[PDB]
């Protein structure tokens, strides 16, 4: 156990999968989605309500 690595493959795989899912969830906040800007404050404060 002490010298050789990659024995604990399964637990590390679980952790990596969870981290990747959470990261790609967070990263989806900068997409335009067809609007004119990703950030909501400027678009709310720059145009009319309609």
């Amino acid at each position: 156990l002490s010298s050789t690595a990659s024995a604990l493959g399964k637990l590390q795989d679980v952790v990596n999968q969870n981290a990747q899912a959470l990261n790609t969830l967070v990263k989806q906040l900068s997409s335009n989605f067809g609007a004119i800007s990703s950030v909501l404050n400027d678009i709310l404060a720059r145009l009319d309500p309609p």
Partner: protein
């Protein structure tokens, strides 16, 4: 702070901004530190509770 807007808790920090860099960043592209344009002192940002 100079165009970029947000909310949170301001704190004093000890980062090492390069002489031309304005605001720091994180792994997920979330603003972390800023440099106030009046005394050039690095400044840290924390989310609310």
């Amino acid at each position: 702070f100079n165009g970029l807007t947000g909310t949170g808790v301001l704190t004093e920090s000890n980062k090492k901004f390069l002489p031309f860099q304005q605001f720091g960043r994180d792994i997920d592209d979330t603003t972390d530190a800023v440099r106030d344009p009046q005394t050039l002192e690095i400044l840290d940002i924390t989310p609310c509770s």
